Amino acid sequence: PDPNQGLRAEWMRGALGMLWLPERTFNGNIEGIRIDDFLTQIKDIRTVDYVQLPLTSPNIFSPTHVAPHPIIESLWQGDTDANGDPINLVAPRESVDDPLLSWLKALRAAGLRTEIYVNSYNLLARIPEDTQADYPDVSARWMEWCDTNTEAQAFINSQTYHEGNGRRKYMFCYAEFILKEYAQRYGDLIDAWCFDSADNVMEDECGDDPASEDVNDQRIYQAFADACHAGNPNAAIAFNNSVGDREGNPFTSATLFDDYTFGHPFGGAGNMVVPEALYTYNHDLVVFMQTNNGYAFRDDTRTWNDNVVAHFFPKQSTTSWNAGNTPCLTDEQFVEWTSTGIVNGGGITWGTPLVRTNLENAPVLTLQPYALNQFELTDTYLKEFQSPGKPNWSRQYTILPAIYPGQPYSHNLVEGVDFWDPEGVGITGLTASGTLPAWLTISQTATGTWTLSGTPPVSEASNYTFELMAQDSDGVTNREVKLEVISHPAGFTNPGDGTPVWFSNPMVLAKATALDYGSLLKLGVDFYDFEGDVLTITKTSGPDWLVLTQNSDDTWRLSGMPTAADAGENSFTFNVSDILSSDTEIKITV
Ligand SMILES: [Ca+2]
Ligand SMILES: [Ca+2]
Ligand SMILES: [Ca+2]
Numbered sequence: 001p002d003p004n005q006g007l008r009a010e011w012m013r014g015a016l017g018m019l020w021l022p023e024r025t026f027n028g029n030i031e032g033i034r035i036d037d038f039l040t041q042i043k044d045i046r047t048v049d050y051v052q053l054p055l056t057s058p059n060i061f062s063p064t065h066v067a068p069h070p071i072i073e074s075l076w077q078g079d080t081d082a083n084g085d086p087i088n089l090v091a092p093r094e095s096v097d098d099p100l101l102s103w104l105k106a107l108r109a110a111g112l113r114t115e116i117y118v119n120s121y122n123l124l125a126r127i128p129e130d131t132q133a134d135y136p137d138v139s140a141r142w143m144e145w146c147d148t149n150t151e152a153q154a155f156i157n158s159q160t161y162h163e164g165n166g167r168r169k170y171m172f173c174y175a176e177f178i179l180k181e182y183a184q185r186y187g188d189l190i191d192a193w194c195f196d197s198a199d200n201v202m203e204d205e206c207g208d209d210p211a212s213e214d215v216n217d218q219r220i221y222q223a224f225a226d227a228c229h230a231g232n233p234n235a236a237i238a239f240n241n242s243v244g245d246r247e248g249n250p251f252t253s254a255t256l257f258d259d260y261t262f263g264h265p266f267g268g269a270g271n272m273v274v275p276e277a278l279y280t281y282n283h284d285l286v287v288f289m290q291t292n293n294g295y296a297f298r299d300d301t302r303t304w305n306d307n308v309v310a311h312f313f314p315k316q317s318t319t320s321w322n323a324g325n326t327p328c329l330t331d332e333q334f335v336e337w338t339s340t341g342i343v344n345g346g347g348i349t350w351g352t353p354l355v356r357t358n359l360e361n362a363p364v365l366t367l368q369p370y371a372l373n374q375f376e377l378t379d380t381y382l383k384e385f386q387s388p389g390k391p392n393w394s395r396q397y398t399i400l401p402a403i404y405p406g407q408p409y410s411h412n413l414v415e416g417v418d419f420w421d422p423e424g425v426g427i428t429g430l431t432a433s434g435t436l437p438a439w440l441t442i443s444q445t446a447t448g449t450w451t452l453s454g455t456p457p458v459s460e461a462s463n464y465t466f467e468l469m470a471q472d473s474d475g476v477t478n479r480e481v482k483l484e485v486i487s488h489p490a491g492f493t494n495p496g497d498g499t500p501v502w503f504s505n506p507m508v509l510a511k512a513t514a515l516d517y518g519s520l521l522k523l524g525v526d527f528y529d530f531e532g533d534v535l536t537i538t539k540t541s542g543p544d545w546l547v548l549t550q551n552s553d554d555t556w557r558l559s560g561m562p563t564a565a566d567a568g569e570n571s572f573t574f575n576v577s578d579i580l581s582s583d584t585e586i587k588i589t590v
């Protein structure tokens with residue numbers, strides 16, 4: 001077996017996780033969507049370690065991806081609706097946006113690891129008898145591509161174990177061409193993969209056996225696992241092979257390629273903790289993680305699965321994992337369930353509910369107020385009790401800002417935010433060790449606030465990796481940090497006076513029609529600031545139809561319906577500011 005099976009998910013022991021999952025991502029709906037509102041909302045939640053994002057959506061939405069891919073995008077064939085909106089487009093366009101990349105980098109910037117949801121049916125149809133109006137021909141076109149493509153047919157014939165029951169060869173094609181490409185593109189930005197509906201497609205239809213410990217019985221599981229590991233060899237994999245046994249071991253036995261347990265709770269649909277017997281069965285799963293120190297399969301007659309990490313994927317609301325207006329647990333219970341499961345135990349991806357997940361029906365992609373409240377109480381508990389004694393650091397990473405050669409550097413590490421004393425006495429001091437830059441300096445500017453400051457020279461062009469050391473009465477705790485020099489984008493000229501600049505003047509965008517427009521303005525593509533100052537954009541003149549709205553610090557969305565009188569050549573003036581500013585003309589033919 002694999003010697004690092006489960007060890008690569010060692011960080012998941014004691015890990016608190018959330019879920020951010022929009023719905024109805026197809027046909028360009030996900031393009032321009034950002035997670036930055038959600039992350040700003042949870043800025044004070046400091047013990048949280050990771051967030052699960054989708055690559056695909058669940059159930060019949062498994063073909064719909066939230067990241068671009070040439071092969072998936074070729075299945076579109078420019079097909080349109082009655083309104084003119086896309087149909088059979090089950091991924092964002094390469095020319096328009098890569099939303100998943102923005103969320104991955106924003107999560108990394110926030111000091112968090114990431115889990116990636118993939119439904120195992122992927123581009124195949126879960127119910128072939130039915131027809132999905134928004135993407136009806138995609139499943140057929142994907143299979144059409146697999147059996148009529150030189151590289152794909154060559155791959156299918158390269159191993160004897162590809163051919164078999166049902167749509168087996170097509171599953172291998174997704175792993176090789178789609179999943180591997182996604183994995184290798186994003187690299188270490190993805191820390192984990194959870195594969196839903198695995199036994200449904202892999203075991204029952206395609207004829208693998210996840211209960212076995214022969215690799216010849218688990219080649220579809222291998223292909224998916226190796227495709228992830230080709231991009232990041234430390235990426236923890238988990239397969240949903242249904243729920244285990246409520247009386248004994250609650251997790252279904254690990255395959256040869258499970259680093260952690262998927263951990264679907266008992267009573268899938270409906271409220272997972274009603275009646276009292278269902279509450280107890282799912283709480284026994286939480287207690288099982290405590291009892292076995294976060295290792296799922298120490299009990300059985302297999303030593304190769306002893307490092308596999310016990311992990312649970314419950315839902316915070318009463319209805320769904322990604323939404324719901326009612327919490328299933330009380331405030332006291334939610335803190336107990338979480339702490340019992342992770343504190344010297346396993347990991348939990350909480351199905352944290354957003355206010356409204358449907359992108360077509362006025363989406364609000366931030367946590368329910370009651371859900372945030374439960375995490376605030378959990379945060380206060382885990383700050384004190386998860387790792388008592390020496391100081392604890394926040395989340396998984398501490399991210400220092402990039403080095404701008406010549407410019408002043410300044411970043412505060414605040415007590416209570418980036419580090420804290422569990423007992424609540426206080427931080428006695430903060431120092432560093434290792435190869436620091438000569439210019440860089442640590443000092444306590446105000447009470448409970450240490451500042452990493454200094455001014456790099458213009459010739460600064462190297463990386464630095466060193467330890468930060470938070471100290472209190474009980475002892476001292478280390479935290480590795482990185483300092484990288486900024487890489488400016490191509491096609492941008494530095495004015496050398498602090499002025500933020502547009503890409504060009506004029507700047508023409510795509511054409512519009514009288515009845516909705518859609519276009520994105522992005523940092524480093526359409527506008528840029530060489531000091532890295534946060535920017536503001538304002539429409540200062542032009543026709544009324546063009547609506548401007550900010551999605552994040554680095555993304556702005558242009559929208560709105562042109563009237564009959566707006567046909568021709570519409571000119572707008574757009575400003576970009578930080579004190580200093582500069583205008584530009586933006587033309588749009590209609
Ligand atoms: Ca933590
Ligand atoms: Ca064992
Ligand atoms: Ca639509």
Ligand SMILES: [Ca+2]
Nearest residue numbers: 389421423474
């Ligand atoms: Ca202490």
Ligand SMILES: [Ca+2]
Nearest residue numbers: 498531533578
């Ligand atoms: Ca500036």
